[PDB]
Design a protein around this ligand. Structure first.
Ligand code: CAZ
Length: 261
């Protein structure tokens, strides 16, 4: 189709490897580009960890309100929220918001720990029917994005389906589903990625990721005017370890989709 050719041209112009999955919930049509190839997730895995804690809170009533100590050993590279609470506490709700809306890596690691480690995040993925997602390491290591390394990867097709199930489907209870969507709509890190390729009147909830090898990712639920919601996953990675981020490539992918379908 014309969209897949435009995505192939975008990829050629980029010098990298582009993976796209769009789900149009109006008729459940799916458009894939490298949709079954594995990409490093980087920080887009924070949605699965936040959703896993929300799932836990369906049966542990006041779980999201529980305080979690932030200790010196918890501090990592990038923790713009958690560093302000070292030797203090944050609630699991606050850690979820910090992970999703600021991509705070200390916050993510507190969620992973709350789930029993990377294997607990993965086990939740399996519980909601995602057999492709794998989380193998904590937040510092998970962004290394070395080519050929299957750790901390998924495919565009799998992540779009999972994001659909979590935000538009029935993977979470209704209060939890709404809270996840509220957090994604308040993301602060996504203006240059999928959002930049979409009309400004469309509502977006998204989670970005960035990592080594110029890896630049964004996963989004989109509510256009005049049509049913869309789920869009855009993954991108490059051959040089120190390649620069290409959020503009993600925005171009979104524009192709928004104009072409
Ligand atoms: C998730 O993707 C996180 N990414 C990182 O921790 C890394 N940021 O490095 C970049 C390339 C952004 C940098 O400025 O050097 C990273 C690269 S290699 C490594 N081990 N970690 C968070 N997510 C985002 C995001 O785009 O959502 C960031 C902007 C960085 S923190």
């Amino acid at each position: 189709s014309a969209v897949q050719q435009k995505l192939a041209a975008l990829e050629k112009s980029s010098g990298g490897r582009l993976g796209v999955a769009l789900i149009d919930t109006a008729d459940n049509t799916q458009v894939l580009y490298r949709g079954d190839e594995r990409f490093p997730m980087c920080s887009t895995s924070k949605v699965m960890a936040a959703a896993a804690v929300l799932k836990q809170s369906e049966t542990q009533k006041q779980l999201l309100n529980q305080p979690v100590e932030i200790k010196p050993a918890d501090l990592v590279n990038y923790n713009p929220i958690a560093e302000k609470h070292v030797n203090g506490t944050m609630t699991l709700a606050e850690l979820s918001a910090a992970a999703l809306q600021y991509s705070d890596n200390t916050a993510m690691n507190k969620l992973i720990a709350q789930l029993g480690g990377p294997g607990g995040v993965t086990a939740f993925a399996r519980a909601i029917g995602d057999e492709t997602f794998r989380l193998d390491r904590t937040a510092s290591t998970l962004n290394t994005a070395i080519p050929g390394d299957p750790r901390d990867t998924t495919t565009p097709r799998a992540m779009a389906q999972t994001l659909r199930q979590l935000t538009l489907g029935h993977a979470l209870g209704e209060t939890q589903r709404a809270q996840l969507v509220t957090w994604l709509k308040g993301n602060t890190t996504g203006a240059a990625s999928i959002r930049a390729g979409l009309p400004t009147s469309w509502t977006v909830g998204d989670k970005t990721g960035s990592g080594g090898y110029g890896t630049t990712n964004d996963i989004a639920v989109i509510w256009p005017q005049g049509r049913a919601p869309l789920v869009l996953v855009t993954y991108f990675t490059q051959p040089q370890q120190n390649a620069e981020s290409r959020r503009d490539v993600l925005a171009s992918a979104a524009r192709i989709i928004a104009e072409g379908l």
